[model samples]
Target: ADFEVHMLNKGKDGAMVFEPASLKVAPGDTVTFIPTDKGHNVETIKGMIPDGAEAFKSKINENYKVTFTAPGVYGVKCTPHYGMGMVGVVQVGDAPANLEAVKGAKNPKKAQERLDAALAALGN
Candidate 1:
């Protein structure tokens, strides 16, 4: 899939967040992240991905693209401000092959909240 969606950023003090945060897309869709607010990069949260899928991250303050493969939910975070709840979700294919695993993955306080919310949106 090659659908395009510009994932937006907001804040908690402004949220320091991702709008349309519980990002959902078709399998292997190419999602776009715009630093509508700069100083952030997208990366996979530790142990929060489909089995055997590669963990990925992008350069800070620059644009990057990832093809969301596999049928599962992905936890995403910004390295520089992950402690601030700079996190979101990405789900592709039909089912979250690693739903429980993602729920069980360790996370920061605020990041937990953000991830739970996104998972809920993804039908968790």
Candidate 2:
């Protein structure tokens, strides 16, 4: 699947958010991040990734796309608005191999709740 994520100043959820906070896609699916608001950037949260997956960061105010090959959960956030809950999760493959590790990473208060909810959206 080719997934598109929009970074918005005030999305349906609230201010400083991604349109879809929890994204589930098949392995090899390409996820594109569009900074619709001009101030957001997509960045991999440190330590919240598959064991061998490479960390990634998109240039500020630019569109970024990443193809998920590693089968696990990836935590994402906008650096400038992370505290305001600009967070997301990408689930690559049906079964996430590193869910625990990704869940263990520290995060800001608001970001943490959003990430938790995002990960929980994987249909259990």
Candidate 3:
């Protein structure tokens, strides 16, 4: 309840084109994508900032939150500007977080597997 995922605008492009483009949220942390532009949404995906994620069709300007209850890789893209390089990632764990880490890890899938392990470990 005390955590938040702040949204950084991608300028007029509706993309998150800036430094610290990605985020690493621990379990029980809440994340939200706030757009300073006109088009954007928190599209949940399967991999990192640039790939393996799904961009939702919603354009978010208000506020939204996804309490990362599990540990794994999540990618976000702008519904309208992802093509313009408006994308980001959120790694929800300590073990090898981030896209580069995920891609470089000996067992990338293991990271996601750990997510399941964490959830099962918590009996969630």
RMSD to true structure for each model, in Å: 2.2, 1.0, 10.0
Range of the 10 consecutive residues with the lowest summed lDDT in candidate 2: 115-124
Error of 1 at 105 (Å): 0.6
lDDT of 3 at 48: 42
Clashing pairs in 2: none
Residue-wise lDDT of candidate 2 within 48-108, one digit each (tens)? 8897789888889999999988889989989899889899998888778788878889999
After aligning candidate 3 to the native by TM-score, how far in Å is the CA of 78 from where it should be? Answer: 1.0
User: What TM-score does prediction 1 earn?
Assistant: 0.88
What TM-score, to 2 decimals, does candidate 3 have?
A: 0.55
The local distance difference test score of each candidate is: 0.78, 0.88, 0.48
Which regions of candidate 2 fall more than 4 Å away from where they truly are?
A: none
List the candidate 1 regions with Cα displacement exceeding 4 Å: 1-14
**For model 3, how big is the CA root-mean-square deviation?**
10.0
Return whichever of 1 and 2 wins on TM-score: 2
| Greater-TM-score candidate between 1 and 3 | 1
Cα displacement (angstroms), candidate 2, residue 75, comes to: 0.4
55-101: candidate 3 lDDT, tens digit per residue: 34445675655566656665555554444555555666675335344
